[PDB]
């Protein structure tokens, strides 16, 4: 039951975040004024990890530096960090092959794709996995699933329709749809290979992706054997179902509580909002995980760190978090928005449902609505932004600018409009 | 009983035939006269209705 | 002060932190026990040479622990007590090393005016004493506790989460000559299951049990005789932190009707630090337990809290293992257990 | 004939005066009853939406329907067995769920109407005029009154508001909705929920269906919700001859809390809800229901968990009782919004003698 | 012809003219020129005039109450269904008649409702009303053991004026600051108050500080009294503790100044709850508990 190793699939979903991920690594970016890797690490610790393995390729030096700086580098940690360095750009099959070549895989190894933070206890899950394994010899891997918000409507990228059994908790079919976004395929598929064996058929769609996998020693060998499987969800699970190796079982764990992985931008925002509220049961910033953090709890879901300065007569709405070393002026209307560490806010600024990253200067008499500002990117005087406007690294938005709905701004100093240099594109300036 | 929309009885007490001030009464009604008044009002309303569709149709005053 | 000095000498600190953060450890008593164990480990293993330096180190450790978890008061308290125990011994030693008059046990003017031994064993003994104290509280309460409740009187019970309060009730109920009717308030988002359990226990004990919803407190208040709190932490001026949900309103009601409000906890739960802010010490619960769905629940921001704070004006009695005390007197008890400099770390 | 005896759970020691038992699943009855009454009774017994205001209206509607369907026998006159039928209906209602003050008033009105027209007139002419009259009455004393109340409230509300609300009172819902839509002010609505009926939840849902900024709380969570917040509104059932607020469950405590924390409470009532019956406590006459409401373990109404509790009869000496209607203190509410615009609650029966 | 001008006309006189009565008289005068036979030409105009007056108000409340009372009276008048001339004449008569009545009412109050102070009962007086002063002076006239305690009123040094008024009567007096008012309740028997208006709820609309006094009285169980001439019933509801239709600012937080200019903007009008009143002395019989509300109901028939 004890002694379990962890392999984390990092630097995999780059260019999916279309403006960012070009200069700095994907996972190093802060969720709520603190890096995304830390949460994942915490989760792993909670689960039960004895050795840490990270897959790095895109900007690996920075990752290494971070690791060196991190708390787990010191000898007090039960798990040590040793990174896998591989050639640039490869699929999860190739990575698996590489891992196999090296050879550290023992027993029930943990494989996590992307970064996930959830509240559910893992020991029970592990126990369940063990018991099910003890049933039959040819058991493969565990999948995590959670109940969705009644009806699906905000899910377009990965709205997977899971046909499931109640007695064994096993997947029957996996399919992706663009149905709510584009009315071309509003569609359902069922295969007849497992009809006269299961009987209890339950057709469901409202289940959210987690992508946390508890895997046996068979999986890397399987990957080595069948080199056609580049992905792990679309081709692999389906293959397993359609009897690639005959007489084999897979898991689909069902939980009533919240569990969602990071995937896009709106989804990320939603996750952040959830974190801000009391959705996750023990996951709160006021506990202080990074040790340098000095967060404290206040009334009406408001987070305040130490050395946070806010001026008199500023009406605040609901759910606000402020990072350390902030100076905010007078006459501000703040509603459902997070302000980063050491940010300098001017005077008379109306904010609604927005997001502000680490060290950003917001200019006087500006309106920000449902838009994101990345690290070290500054807003000037009189800037009016609409819903879902992503701003990249070090973008200097100077005096007087207006940007419409869903305008993406580049991060590296290419194809998308508005650049890192002085003034965003209303008058042509840049490289 | 009265409030909004419902038909209610009137008789002209005092008229200022110079600028526009009209005095109206409900209790003065000559007994059953109320019913007659109501009928008259209804008739007037019907007449108005009659000369509304034609005004909109032929586009004339 | 970082954890650079303690890595191979003491390792359990990290484990303690883990227990605190993800709530693997439950019940204040257990936390206290853990703290005691940690202290013992520190004592048995580490090296000192000097005494003041050691004291400073201990203080630093305490501070670190506090920083790791603020809602664990018992942990802090125990440490403070240990420090106090050390301090007196140190003071005694100094007098022999050098080789005084006082009106009472402690003097105010001594602060204004200018003022190797086997202390380790004494320190060790202190821990044991503390453990012993923790072990039995109910035995030192029941001699005072089963004197207040009378025949044909009605009790009202907010917070059934505490293990001591139930025991106290049971001891009273044991007596054949005494008969009382029990009204139990539920506490919806945090106390419900616990309340139910308490009710079941009462039923088992063969007493008249009345399960009352949180709304039906007002109608029965003309018959209510006494009020008992299931508090978790005691403080300086009198104010107390209660073991989750449905305490404040009931207390207010009692105050309005001039119903006597009792409190049973213990001196290990008693803290020498002041509760200056309600927002700082009181921790909030979870939104997920109240209402299903997530997408419409972004609009529906729900407010729910674990712990509850009650002002010292409503509560009048604090019966502990030593005896019956008041909110106007309990400060002195704390002083008798924790010294003057040991308050700030 | 009906059904008698057989009651679930313990009868308890205290609070035993009113009916708490009965037909839940129908078995053998008199073969003359119009089914609409039965259906209504079935609804009322297992209702989670209604709260003082709509019930009476529903009853009136039912009565109207009955009148429409009513046919005079060839032998006996229009009123001979009609009274008996009415009595039977009343008995059925009582068996299902005890009669309210509004319902009593309605019954009285019906009786008066019956007395007014003596058996001499033909069938199709009498009931034509009766139904119209009743409709007119309904239009007058109910809807119009409500509208008036709403308008009064409109002028009474100032600038910058933060309100804590409770109940499934329709008038309050109307008010809040009005505030949200047509006034366009800075309104914040905080909702309090109760265990016996999910009224708060319903209110929240309604608010959502409009698009209002909503905080959601309970009876326990009140010490932290204040720590900016000013107005408190409650829904009343009936005001007695004493002047005390004879209303639903969790109101009185809230009022007390409001009183404690500076700012007073405002309650709304209709100009027909007033009663001549004298009582000063909840012990006198109370709406008591079966302990089946206090079985579900949080979250939602339909969940059914095999947790810790699930027995009542087998348990030795265990009393699980809950109350629905309460009597709040007189001095605590300051504002009363009735048919005569504005007034104090200490007036008691100023409209009762006025009729 | 103007009502505002008429109102202005009285300044240095007063002290018996019940301002509202004067207002009523002015209204009557305004009416009896442009033919009160027609209701179309007249009532609307009267309403407009009242609105104008309201708009022009610096710091007065009772005017509205007076005007609405007048309106009510007018309404009552034309229920006899006789003739337009005689009724009009009667209405015209009823203006000066109303003024005449006030004096009689005052007399009634000063002869019947003065029995509260008899056995050397020490009185705490705040809020300037003419009726209370009349009661005091006419008690002195009657000769009775009595003592006076004065709380310092500060709108524009009215306390001093009050003191001076007291002086021209022969009676020992002392000055008390409304901060040390909590310290002295021991020797002082009963608290008496003059009001600007009586609310729909029952409570009292008054001056610079009364609520605190009421609270103190409640604490001490020494009864709180209000003496007013019975015509100060306005259709106004103070729903919360700190709300009234006020001309002045309701607790305005002024910006950071340096030369000490904006400071004196403290609450000059305060409201107390309905439960605080023990006895309300009025000319239309000794009535208190829920009498004002009843009167209002009678007036509006609702």
Swiss-Prot record, chain A:
Entry annotated with the keyword Protein biosynthesis: yes
Gene Ontology biological process terms from the UniProt entry: cytoplasmic translational initiation; regulation of translational initiation
Location within or outside the cell: Cytoplasm, Cytosol
One Gene Ontology cellular component annotation held by this UniProt entry: cytosol
Principal localisation: cytoplasm
GO MF assignments: guanyl-nucleotide exchange factor activity; translation initiation factor activity; translation initiation factor binding
This protein's UniProt keywords: Cytoplasm, Initiation factor, Phosphoprotein, Protein biosynthesis, Translation regulation
Sequence similarity: Belongs to the eIF-2B gamma/epsilon subunits family.
Miscellaneous comment: Present with 33800 molecules/cell in log phase SD medium.
Complexes and interactors: Component of the translation initiation factor 2B (eIF2B) complex which is a heterodecamer of two sets of five different subunits: alpha, beta, gamma, delta and epsilon. Subunits alpha, beta and delta comprise a regulatory subcomplex and subunits epsilon and gamma comprise a catalytic subcomplex. Within the complex, the hexameric regulatory complex resides at the center, with the two heterodimeric catalytic subcomplexes bound on opposite sides.
Protein name in UniProt: Translation initiation factor eIF2B subunit epsilon
Residues of the full protein shown: 24 to 472 of 712
Swiss-Prot record, chain C:
One of the GO BP terms on file: translational initiation
UniProt-listed Gene3D superfamilies: translation initiation factor eif-2b, domain 1, Translation initiation factor eif-2b, domain 2
Role, per record: Acts as a component of the translation initiation factor 2B (eIF2B) complex, which catalyzes the exchange of GDP for GTP on the eukaryotic initiation factor 2 (eIF2) complex gamma subunit. Its guanine nucleotide exchange factor activity is repressed when bound to eIF2 complex phosphorylated on the alpha subunit, thereby limiting the amount of methionyl-initiator methionine tRNA available to the ribosome and consequently global translation is repressed.
GO cellular component, one term: eukaryotic translation initiation factor 2B complex
TM spans (from-to): none
A single MF term (Gene Ontology): translation initiation factor activity
Main location as per UniProt: cytoplasm
Assembly: Component of the translation initiation factor 2B (eIF2B) complex which is a heterodecamer of two sets of five different subunits: alpha, beta, gamma, delta and epsilon. Subunits alpha, beta and delta comprise a regulatory subcomplex and subunits epsilon and gamma comprise a catalytic subcomplex. Within the complex, the hexameric regulatory complex resides at the center, with the two heterodimeric catalytic subcomplexes bound on opposite sides.
Family annotation (Pfam families): IF-2B
Organism whose genome encodes this protein: Saccharomyces cerevisiae (strain ATCC 204508 / S288c) (Baker's yeast)
Name of the protein: Translation initiation factor eIF2B subunit beta
From Swiss-Prot, chain D:
Domain of life: Eukaryota
Major subcellular location class: cytoplasm
Location of the region described as Disordered in the Swiss-Prot/TrEMBL record: 328-355
Subcellular location: Cytoplasm, Cytosol
Skewed-composition ranges (Basic and acidic residues): 342-352
One annotated GO biological process: regulation of translational initiation
Membrane as UniProt keyword: no
Keywords attached to this entry: Acetylation, Cytoplasm, Initiation factor, Phosphoprotein, Protein biosynthesis, Repressor, Translation regulation
GO cellular component assignments: cytosol; eukaryotic translation initiation factor 2B complex; guanyl-nucleotide exchange factor complex
GO molecular function per UniProt: enzyme regulator activity; translation initiation factor activity
Keyword Cytoplasm among UniProt keywords: yes
Subunit note: Component of the translation initiation factor 2B (eIF2B) complex which is a heterodecamer of two sets of five different subunits: alpha, beta, gamma, delta and epsilon. Subunits alpha, beta and delta comprise a regulatory subcomplex and subunits epsilon and gamma comprise a catalytic subcomplex. Within the complex, the hexameric regulatory complex resides at the center, with the two heterodimeric catalytic subcomplexes bound on opposite sides.
Note: Present with 10300 molecules/cell in log phase SD medium.
The family this protein is said to belong to: Belongs to the eIF-2B alpha/beta/delta subunits family.
Protein name: Translation initiation factor eIF2B subunit delta
Gene: GCD2
UniProtKB/Swiss-Prot annotation, chain E:
An example Gene Ontology CC term for this record: guanyl-nucleotide exchange factor complex
Superkingdom of the organism of origin: Eukaryota
Signal peptide: none
Phosphothreonine PTM positions: 288
GO molecular function, one term: translation initiation factor activity
Phenotypic effect of disruption: Inhibits GCN4 derepression in glucose, amino acid, or purine-starved cells.
Keyword flag Plastid: no
Keywords from the named record: Acetylation, Activator, Cytoplasm, Initiation factor, Phosphoprotein, Protein biosynthesis, Repressor, Translation regulation
GO biological process, one term: translational initiation
Compartments it resides in: Cytoplasm, Cytosol
Coiled-coil regions listed: none
Function according to Swiss-Prot or TrEMBL: Acts as a component of the translation initiation factor 2B (eIF2B) complex, which catalyzes the exchange of GDP for GTP on the eukaryotic initiation factor 2 (eIF2) complex gamma subunit. Its guanine nucleotide exchange factor activity is repressed when bound to eIF2 complex phosphorylated on the alpha subunit, thereby limiting the amount of methionyl-initiator methionine tRNA available to the ribosome and consequently global translation is repressed.
Leftover remarks: Present with 8970 molecules/cell in log phase SD medium.
Family according to the record: Belongs to the eIF-2B alpha/beta/delta subunits family.
Listed name of the protein: Translation initiation factor eIF2B subunit alpha
Classification of source organism: Eukaryota, Fungi, Dikarya, Ascomycota, Saccharomycotina
């Amino acid at each position: 039951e004890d002694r379990l190793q962890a392999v984390v699939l990092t630097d995999s979903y780059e260019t999916r975040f279309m403006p960012l991920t070009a200069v700095k690594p994907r996972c190093l970016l802060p969720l709520a004024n603190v890096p995304l890797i830390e949460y994942t690490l915490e989760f792993l610790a909670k689960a039960g990890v004895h050795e840490v393995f990270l897959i790095c390729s895109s900007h690996a030096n920075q990752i290494n530096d971070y690791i060196e700086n991190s708390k787990w580098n010191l000898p007090w940690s039960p798990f040590k960090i040793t990174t896998i360095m591989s050639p640039e750009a490869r699929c999860t099959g190739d990575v698996m092959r590489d891992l196999d070549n090296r050879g550290i895989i023992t027993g029930d190894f943990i494989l996590v794709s992307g970064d996930v933070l959830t509240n559910i206890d893992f020991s029970k899950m592990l126990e369940f996995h063990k018991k099910m394994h003890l049933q039959d010899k040819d058991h493969i891997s565990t999948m995590c699933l959670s109940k969705a918000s009644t009806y699906p409507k905000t899910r377009t990228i990965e709205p997977a329709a899971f046909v499931l059994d109640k007695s064994t908790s096993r997947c029957i079919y996996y399919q992706d749809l663009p149905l709510p976004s584009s009315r071309e395929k509003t569609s359902i598929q069922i295969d007849p290979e497992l009809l006269d064996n299961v009987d209890e058929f339950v057709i469901r769609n409202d289940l959210i992706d987690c992508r946390i996998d508890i895997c046996t020693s068979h999986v890397p060998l399987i990957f080595q054997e069948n080199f056609d499987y580049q992905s792990l969800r679309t081709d692999f699970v389906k293959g397993v179902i359609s009897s690639d190796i005959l007489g084999k079982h897979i898991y689909a764990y069902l939980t009533d509580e919240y569990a969602v992985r990071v995937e896009s931008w709106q989804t990320y925002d939603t996750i952040s909002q959830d974190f801000l509220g009391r959705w996750c049961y023990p996951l709160v910033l006021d506990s202080n995980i990074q040790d340098d953090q000095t967060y404290s709890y206040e009334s009406r879901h408001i987070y305040k760190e130490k050395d946070v300065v806010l001026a008199q007569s500023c009406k605040i709405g609901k759910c606000t978090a402020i990072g350390s070393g902030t100076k905010i002026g007078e006459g501000t209307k703040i509603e459902n928005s997070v302000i980063g560490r050491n940010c300098q806010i001017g005077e008379n600024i109306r904010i609604k449902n927005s997001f502000i990253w680490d060290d950003c200067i917001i200019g006087n008499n500006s309106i920000i609505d449902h838009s994101l500002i990345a690290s070290n990117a500054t807003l000037g005087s009189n800037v009016r932004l609409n819903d879902g406007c992503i701003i990249g690294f070090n973008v200097k938005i100077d005096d007087n600018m207006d940007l419409d709905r869903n305008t993406k701004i580049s991060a590296s100093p290419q194809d998308l409009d508005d650049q890192t240099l002085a003034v965003s594109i209303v008058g042509d300036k840049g490289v | 009983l009265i409030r909004v929309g419902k038909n209610d009885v009137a008789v002209v007490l005092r008229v200022d035939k110079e600028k526009g001030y009209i005095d109206l009464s409900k209790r003065r009604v000559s007994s059953e006269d109320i019913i007659k008044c109501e009928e008259k009002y209804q008739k007037s309303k019907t007449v108005h209705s009659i000369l509304r569709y034609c005004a909109e149709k032929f586009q004339i005053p | 002060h970082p954890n650079a000095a303690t890595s191979d000498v003491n390792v359990t600190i990290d484990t303690f932190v883990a227990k605190l953060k993800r709530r693997q450890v439950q019940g204040s008593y257990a936390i206290a026990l853990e703290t005691l164990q940690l202290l013992m480990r520190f004592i048995s293993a580490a090296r000192w040479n000097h005494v003041n330096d050691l004291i400073e180190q201990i203080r630093d450790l305490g501070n670190s622990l506090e920083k790791a978890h603020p809602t664990a008061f018992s942990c802090g308290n125990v440490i403070r007590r240990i420090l106090a125990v050390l301090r007196d011994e140190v003071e005694e030693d100094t007098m022999s090393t050098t080789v005084v008059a006082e009106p009472l046990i402690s003097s105010m003017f001594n602060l204004l005016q200018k003022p190797k031994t086997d202390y380790r064993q004494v320190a060790i003994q202190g821990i044991k004493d503390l453990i012993d104290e923790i072990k039995n509280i109910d035995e030192g309460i029941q001699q005072i506790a089963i004197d207040l409740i009378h025949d044909h009187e009605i009790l009202l019970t907010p917070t059934p989460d505490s293990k001591t309060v139930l025991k106290f009730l049971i001891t009273a109920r044991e007596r054949s000559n005494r008969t009382f009717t029990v009204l139990v308030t539920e506490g919806f988002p945090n106390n419900t299951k616990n309340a139910h359990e308490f009710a079941k226990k009462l039923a088992q004990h063969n007493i008249e049990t009345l399960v009352v919803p949180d709304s039906a407190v007002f109608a029965l208040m003309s018959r209510v005789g006494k009020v008992i709190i299931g508090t978790k932490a005691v403080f300086v001026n009198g104010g107390t932190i209660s073991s989750n949900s449905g305490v404040s309103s009931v207390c207010e009601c009692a105050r309005e009707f001039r119903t006597p409000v009792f409190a049973v906890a213990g001196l290990y739960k008693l803290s020498p630090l002041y509760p200056f802010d309600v927002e700082k010490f009181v921790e909030f619960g979870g939104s997920q337990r109240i209402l299903p769905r997530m997408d419409p629940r972004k609009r529906l921001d729900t407010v729910n809290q674990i712990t509850d704070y009650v002002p010292p004006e409503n509560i009048d009695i604090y019966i502990t293992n030593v005896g019956g005390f008041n909110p106007s007197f309990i400060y002195r008890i704390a002083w008798d257990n924790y010294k003057q400099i040991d308050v700030h770390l | 004939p009906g059904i008698s005896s057989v009651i679930p759970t313990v009868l308890e020691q205290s609070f035993d005066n009113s009916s708490l038992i009965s037909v839940k699943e129908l078995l053998l009855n008199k073969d003359l009853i119009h089914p609409s009454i039965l259906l209504l009774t079935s609804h009322l017994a297992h209702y989670k939406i209604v709260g003082s205001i709509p019930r009476c209206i529903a009853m009136l509607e039912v009565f109207q329907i009955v009148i429409k369907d009513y046919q005079t026998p060839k032998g006996t006159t229009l009123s001979r067995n009609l009274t008996s039928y009415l009595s039977h209906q009343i008995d059925l209602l009582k068996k299902a769920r005890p009669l309210s003050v509004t319902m009593g008033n309605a019954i009285r009105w019906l009786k008066q109407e019956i007395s007014l027209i003596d058996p001499s007139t033909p069938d199709k002419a009498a009931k034509k005029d009766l139904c119209e009259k009743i409709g007119q009455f309904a239009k007058e004393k109910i809807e119009l009154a409500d509208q008036l109340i709403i308008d009064n409230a409109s002028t009474q509300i100032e600038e910058s508001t933060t309100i804590v609300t409770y109940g499934s009172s329709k008038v309050l819902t109307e008010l809040l909705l009005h505030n949200a839509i047509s006034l366009k002010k800075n309104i914040k609505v905080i909702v309090v929920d109760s265990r016996p009926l999910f009224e708060g939840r319903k209110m929240a849902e309604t608010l959502r269906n409009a698009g209002v900024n909503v905080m959601y709380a309970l009876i326990t969570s009140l010490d932290t919700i204040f720590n900016d917040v000013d107005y408190v509104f409650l829904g009343a059932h009936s005001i007695l001859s004493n002047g005390f607020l004879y209303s639903r469950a969790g109101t009185a405590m809230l009022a007390m809390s409001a009183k404690r924390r500076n700012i007073p409470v405002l309650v709304c009532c209709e100009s027909l809800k007033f009663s001549q019956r004298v009582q000063l406590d909840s012990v006198t006459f109370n709406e008591l229901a079966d302990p089946n409401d206090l079985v579900n373990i949080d979250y939602e109404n339909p969940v059914e968990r095999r947790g810790n509790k699930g027995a009542l009869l087998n348990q030795f000496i265990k009393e699980r009782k809950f109350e629905k209607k309460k009597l709040a203190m007189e001095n605590k509410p300051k504002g009363n919004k009735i048919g005569g615009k504005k007034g104090s609650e200490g007036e008691s029966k100023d409209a009762s003698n006025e009729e | 012809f103007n009502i505002t001008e008429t109102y202005l006309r009285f300044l240095e006189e007063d002290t018996e003219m019940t301002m509202p009565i004067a207002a009523i008289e002015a209204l009557v005068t305004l009416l009896r020129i442009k033919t009160p036979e027609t209701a179309a030409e007249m009532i609307n105009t009267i309403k407009s005039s009242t609105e104008e007056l309201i708009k022009s108000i610096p710091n007065s409340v009772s005017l509205r109450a007076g005007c609405d009372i007048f309106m009510r009276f007018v309404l009552r008048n034309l229920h006899l269904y006789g003739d337009w001339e005689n009724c009009k004449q009667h209405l015209i008569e009823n203006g000066q008649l109303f003024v005449s009545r006030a004096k009689k009412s005052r007399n009634k109050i000063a002869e019947i409702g003065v029995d509260f102070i008899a056995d050397d009962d020490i009185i705490l007086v705040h809020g300037y009303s003419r009726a209370v002063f009349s009661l005091l002076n006419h008690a002195a006239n009657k000769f009775i053991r009595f003592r006076c305690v004065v709380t310092e009123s500060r709108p524009s040094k009215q306390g001093n004026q009050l003191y001076t008024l007291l002086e021209q009567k022969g009676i020992p007096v002392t000055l008390i600051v409304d901060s040390a008012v909590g310290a002295v309740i021991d020797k002082v028997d009963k608290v008496f108050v003059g009001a600007e208006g009586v609310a729909e709820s029952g409570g009292i609309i008054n001056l610079v500080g009364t609520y605190s006094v009421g609270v103190l009285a409640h604490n001490a169980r020494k009864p709180f009294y209000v003496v007013t001439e019975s015509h100060k019933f306005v259709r106004m509801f103070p729903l919360s503790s700190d709300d009234l239709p006020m001309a002045g600012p309701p607790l305005d937080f002024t910006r950071r100044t340096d030369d000490l200019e904006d400071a004196l903007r403290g609450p000059t009008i305060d409201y107390t709850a309905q439960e605080y009143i023990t006895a309300l002395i009025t000319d239309l019989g000794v009535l208190t508990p829920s009498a004002v509300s009843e009167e209002l109901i009678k007036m509006w028939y609702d």
